[PDB]
């Protein structure tokens, strides 16, 4: 697939809507403000919308290497605060994904270049659940490290003064920790979803335990 | 639809591709490196692999407010810098859409909050083809500050330490300026394609003049 | 200048403060707020309390190369957030230096590395102020250059959501725009005085009007 | 001391210096490019040049709240950056000191607005001493961490591609860890001092085993 292709590709696919689908905008045009909100990975192994069967108009995605949630990140910052305050959306979902190439990159520690420092914010997962994942088989490390930076990024989300504020204000937005494999694109509740300060500390620590 | 529909709509869509394309992962799971980067807005109208046609795996896929590349938005420059130089993406794709609530949320200018501040480099632009936008009929300013916001962000793109880098040891990356709306999903080729320093500069004056 | 020397010469600089002046950590112990935020250059050519006389404990500092603010610099922004919110400084000072070495290396253009995509923001400038430029002599366009960057850097602080807020607020906030030279150490007011949106917008044509 | 008593200083300040050091700005015009780099708090209590007696031309100077070398902080890294290739600076000093206004807010948590996603950082770190700081008494617990958060800044700031790359490549450039309190002044040298990507892990696990 070339550029043309893709370029082709599209115009015959919006030419065919008309037949299969010719209401395909109608949810679009009708400003239908997303209730979702999908933090993902770069790599995009298989896309939020596939996994979940969520329509045009109905998700509002960001997307990073390793799907990450740093305290100081205003690009990631800015796509929340946008969704909660002026979107207000009900769920905020942070999705990763087994054999992730940053959390592998991270572990593996390859010079690959800028990219090494927003992977060092992996590493300190990687070093601060040292003792857990001591106490697993190493056939199962990796895949849990990118369980516990699902978890870590929920929590550092929670902890930001936007989902403070919001919750403080009262507004009902939940966060939840996902992930899914390709090797069927089954998605995994983690289990740390928060609705509040208080969820949000119980259900770290009961994901933190259940691994 | 809430949070158990996707969760059971996932599980459902999962063991129905065992019928249906049981090699849904094949492509995956050979470790196929994605040779397409899109960066695309938050508001998602049409996904791009809607848009495109393009399989999983074949899309690296960054998404912020707007579709910006902020010249030290260490994030977007991550994605890009891990894309081009590990993953060796040979097309970079930067794509708006008419009617984005970031671009418009701009020229109004309400008091939004945190994301008031990551706007105000589309501000930048607005301010900066204000010539431009007077020789137009008032009812397409808007969708040309659009267009022109994907023309700036591939000149930033192509502007940045990584690109000029690339380009500069020879690696054939191109950058492309792509915009839809949602009364068609037909994309528009912004016709600002770069594939060295000089035909960004060359195309970048040739998207302006055609506007 | 070896380590050594700095750490030796601190000890003796300390203890013969108890003969000189024992009362030099007085305002220091008891906790003075300071009334000024002083936004620099890490150049740092001639320091800021050597420039105006300030005292220990008298001045906020944020340094960066060649003195920015930009829109999304979550660094540059949490110092003002802190200054202006929480420590409630009267005045924000930004101040540039003739012959600074980041407004050099913006206008020729060297491949220094990662600090280039630094630097693109102020090309911007001198991309966006190249008509005012060209009706002066040569000589004198990189000390202007350096001028406009401080205009615009507070162009950029009075826009951004910390000083709208405060501003509206009601807050007695006013921001400045000085430089200086290394040939004789004399502070220079730019004359973009703000002290509400109103000044900021006003007192910005006027600077731009007097070059 | 208002405005214009600072305008007024300088401009007396600048006068006088032709009686008592005409030659003050003579190693400026010489270009005198600084061999040291001072990463500060933006509380700049006691100024570096002060602490140190370094004149002016010989410190390259950033400062932000609680002196934080963030692993994805391109304001600080495109000073390192900087400072370490172009100016080939031989010594990178970070110094915190005891009583700092971020790592105490850190610690407290009180609601100060946007600044505190910048303190989460310090939360993380006092987490993860969390074991250390138990066997201590509690008068010497907010201390320690000032010390702690100094040496994890220079570890940061060791594992950054920046330093990274200059050690693989043969530049000498030693990163220390300093701390100072308004007590007396006096610099504390925390002996994390690194050379290399040997030692500063080393000298890491020394100076948190001298705590
Ligand atoms: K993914
Ligand atoms: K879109
Ligand atoms: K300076
Ligand atoms: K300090
Ligand atoms: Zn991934
Ligand atoms: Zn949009
Ligand atoms: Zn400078
Ligand atoms: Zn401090």
């Given at each position: 697939?070339?550029?043309?292709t ?40 298989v896309?939020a919308?596939?996994?979940t ?38 769920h905020?979902?942070?999705?990763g ?72 204000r009262?507004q ?9 494999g ?7 509740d983690?289990?740390?979803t928060?609705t ?8 770290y ?7």
């Amino acid at each position: 697939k070339d550029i043309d292709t893709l370029i082709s590709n599209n115009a015959l696919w919006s030419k065919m809507l008309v037949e299969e689908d010719p209401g395909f905008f109608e949810k679009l045009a009708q400003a239908q403000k997303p209730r979702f909100l999908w933090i993902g990975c770069s790599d995009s192994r298989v896309p939020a919308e596939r996994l979940t069967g969520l329509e045009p108009g109905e998700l509002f995605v960001h997307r990073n290497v390793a799907n990450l949630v740093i305290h100081t990140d205003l690009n990631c910052l800015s796509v929340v605060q946008y969704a909660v305050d002026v979107l207000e959306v009900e769920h905020i979902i942070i999705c990763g994904h087994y054999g992730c190439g940053g959390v592998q990159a991270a572990v593996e520690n390859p010079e690959l270049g800028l990219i090494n420092n927003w992977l060092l914010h992996i590493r300190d997962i990687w070093f601060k659940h040292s003792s857990l994942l001591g106490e697993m088989p190493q056939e199962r490390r990796l895949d849990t490290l990118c369980e516990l930076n699902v978890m870590e990024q929920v929590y550092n989300l929670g902890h930001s003064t936007i989902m403070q504020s919001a919750w403080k204000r009262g507004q009902k937005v939940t966060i939840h920790g996902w992930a899914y494999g390709i090797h069927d694109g089954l998605l995994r509740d983690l289990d740390v979803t928060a609705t509040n300060r208080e969820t949000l500390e119980q259900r770290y620590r009961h994901g933190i335990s259940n691994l």
